[PDB]
Design an enzyme around this catalytic site. Structure first.
Site, PDB file in Angstrom:
ATOM      1  N   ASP A 110      36.283  67.712 -17.225  1.00 46.16           N
ATOM      2  CA  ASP A 110      36.582  66.311 -17.575  1.00 46.16           C
ATOM      3  C   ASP A 110      37.763  66.091 -18.493  1.00 46.16           C
ATOM      4  O   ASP A 110      38.243  66.982 -19.193  1.00 46.16           O
ATOM      5  CB  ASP A 110      35.310  65.861 -18.324  1.00 46.16           C
ATOM      6  CG  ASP A 110      34.015  66.001 -17.541  1.00 46.16           C
ATOM      7  OD1 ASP A 110      33.937  65.680 -16.327  1.00 46.16           O
ATOM      8  OD2 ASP A 110      32.994  66.391 -18.145  1.00 46.16           O
TER       9      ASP A 110
ATOM     10  N   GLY B 191      33.702  71.367 -27.291  1.00 49.78           N
ATOM     11  CA  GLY B 191      34.163  71.758 -25.972  1.00 49.78           C
ATOM     12  C   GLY B 191      32.994  72.085 -25.023  1.00 49.78           C
ATOM     13  O   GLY B 191      33.103  71.751 -23.839  1.00 49.78           O
TER      14      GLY B 191
ATOM     15  N   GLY C 299      32.726  76.874 -21.029  1.00 53.49           N
ATOM     16  CA  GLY C 299      33.897  76.648 -20.182  1.00 53.49           C
ATOM     17  C   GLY C 299      35.158  76.771 -21.065  1.00 53.49           C
ATOM     18  O   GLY C 299      35.017  76.865 -22.293  1.00 53.49           O
TER      19      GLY C 299
ATOM     20  N   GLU D  78      27.803  32.869  -9.173  1.00 47.75           N
ATOM     21  CA  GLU D  78      27.580  31.415  -9.183  1.00 47.75           C
ATOM     22  C   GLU D  78      27.241  30.890 -10.560  1.00 47.75           C
ATOM     23  O   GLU D  78      27.728  29.816 -10.916  1.00 47.75           O
ATOM     24  CB  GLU D  78      26.438  30.968  -8.196  1.00 47.75           C
ATOM     25  CG  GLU D  78      26.760  31.368  -6.744  1.00 47.75           C
ATOM     26  CD  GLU D  78      28.072  30.787  -6.217  1.00 47.75           C
ATOM     27  OE1 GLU D  78      28.507  29.693  -6.644  1.00 47.75           O
ATOM     28  OE2 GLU D  78      28.765  31.366  -5.360  1.00 47.75           O
TER      29      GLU D  78
END
Ligand code: CA
Ligand code: CA
Ligand code: CA
Ligand code: CA
Ligand code: CA
Ligand code: CA
Ligand code: CA
Ligand code: CA
Ligand code: ZN
Length: 455
Positions: A327, A358, A361, A167
């Site tokens: 990701d 990195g 992983g 609004e």
């Protein structure tokens, strides 16, 4: 003729493209097209004392205004303390992006004046406001009665808070995205949903976004990507907001409830507006697989949701930290610091000399063009782990491979892998054009082997 890692990056980078296709018969509009649609009444506040900013005052009415009883609005009530506090955060979220200021006080040298209050009768709606060219310019009114209690408890991420921001957007001169028993079927363009604008009435499910987490759905509290362009077109962009280094997300230093995450179950829905500095999107506290794009105007899929984070046109965000999930991280043309965290991440620095981490992983550092990392502006991979991480050049080589040699031979595709043990620095130099000098260079912390390269 590219690896799957590069195809994932490339597909994500175009996933929310706008302006060039139909969606079920509706035309996709770019952000600039929406900025004109949302401002199509031509109504706006004017800078009556010429100081370069729209300076407005506002009051929480405590008594019914003159003539109230003939309006057909039922019982009047003043805002509660919680409605006032939330209304002030909504007003702040608009002043952050555009050169409009709101000060609580009586109508006095002001360019305009706003009032807020509650009413009890329903006339088809939960709330309503007037545009700045009306005789009731500045008014906004919120329904509260025994059957509709949403406006009594506005809070971050719920529809009572969104209703306030919406609004106020009308009081500033924004219209609904369409001229509206209406539904998304009456939308004029495909992006008329609450994933792109808080002015829309239609669920983000119509455009495919997933905002629901652990059974519940959320609402953006603050202006979204299209709203920011629309209100900046009317009053100009506010470049002083957050002009020093800022962190959004986890560890936020933005000082705004809708930009802060404090747990892995948080539902973030925001569009970043930032006026300068070296800034970071920190999403390290989520464990879902996330897709994070630093390109101005683009969307990211964060915290287990999709299309819920965006960066406004005109903003440059430099750094991004992923979470413990696998990701995707897409940098932009500036020098970016991109951190994958735990999980097997795919990282694309893009233009400029980037700093890539990195994390643990097996990560893949993806290069889409020779200018991504040249001898004068080369990326550095800070934690390269040979045998686990990969450097991927397939978008450039189209899988034709490389010729590993100890010295350039004068043929295109020759590559030299070296390692300097006293500074623990490796490098990959490639002569893509064939004149016997490197046109491409990537450096690392840690040794790099021939088998760590995908080409
Ligand atoms: Ca003024
Ligand atoms: Ca900043
Ligand atoms: Ca910046
Ligand atoms: Ca990760
Ligand atoms: Ca970059
Ligand atoms: Ca990682
Ligand atoms: Ca790694
Ligand atoms: Ca780069
Ligand atoms: Zn409305």
């Amino acid at each position: 003729g590219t690896s799957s890692a590069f195809t994932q990056i490339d597909n994500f980078s175009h996933f929310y493209d706008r302006g060039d296709h139909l969606v079920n018969g509706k035309p996709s509009f770019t952000v600039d097209q929406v900025a004109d649609q949302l401002t199509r009444s031509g109504a706006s506040w004017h800078d009556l004392n010429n100081d370069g900013v729209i300076n407005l005052t506002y009051t929480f009415l405590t008594a019914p205004p003159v003539g109230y009883a003939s309006r057909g609005l039922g019982t009047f009530s003043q805002f509660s303390a919680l409605q006032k506090e939330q209304a002030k955060l909504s007003l702040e979220s608009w002043a952050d992006v555009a050169k409009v200021t709101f000060t609580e006080g009586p109508a006095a040298g002001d360019d305009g004046h706003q009032t807020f209050a509650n009413f009890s009768a329903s006339n088809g709606g939960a709330a309503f406001a007037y545009l700045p060219n009306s005789s009731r310019k500045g008014e906004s009114w919120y329904l509260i009665n025994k059957d509709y209690q949403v406006n009594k408890t506005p809070g971050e991420g719920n529809y009572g808070r969104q209703t306030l921001t919406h609004e106020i957007g009308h009081t500033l001169g924004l219209s609904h995205p369409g001229d509206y028993n209406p539904t998304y079927r009456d939308a004029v363009y495909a992006e008329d949903t609450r994933a792109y604008s808080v002015m829309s009435y239609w669920s983000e499910k119509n455009t495919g976004q997933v905002f629901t987490k652990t059974g519940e759905g959320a609402y953006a509290s603050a202006p979204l990507l299209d709203d920011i362009a629309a209100v900046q077109k009317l009053y100009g962009a506010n470049l002083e907001t957050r002009a020093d280094d800022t962190v959004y997300g986890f560890n936020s230093t933005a000082d705004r409830d809708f930009y802060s995450a404090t747990s892995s179950t948080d539902k973030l829905i925001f569009s970043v507006w930032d006026g300068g500095g070296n800034d970071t999107l920190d999403f390290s506290g989520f464990s879902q697989n996330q897709k994070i794009n630093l390109t101005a105007g683009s969307f990211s899929d964060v915290g287990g949701m999709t299309g819920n984070v965006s960066i406004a046109q005109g903003v440059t965000i430099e750094n991004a930290i992923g979470g413990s999930g696998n990701d995707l991280l897409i940098g932009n043309d500036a020098a970016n610091v991109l951190k994958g965290g735990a999980g097997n991440d795919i990282i694309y620095g893009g233009g400029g000399a980037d700093v890539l981490w990195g994390g643990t992983g097996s990560d893949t550092f993806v290069f889409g063009a020779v200018s991504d990392s040249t001898p004068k502006a080369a990326d550095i991979i800070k934690d390269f782990q040979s045998g686990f991480d990969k450097i991927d050049l397939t978008a450039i080589t189209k899988l034709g491979g490389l010729n590993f040699v100890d010295a350039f031979t004068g043929h295109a595709g020759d590559a030299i892998v070296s390692y300097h043990q006293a500074s623990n620095a490796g490098s990959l130099q490639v002569d893509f054009s064939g004149q016997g000098v490197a046109d491409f260079l990537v450096t690392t912390v840690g040794q790099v082997a021939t088998y760590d390269i995908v080409a």
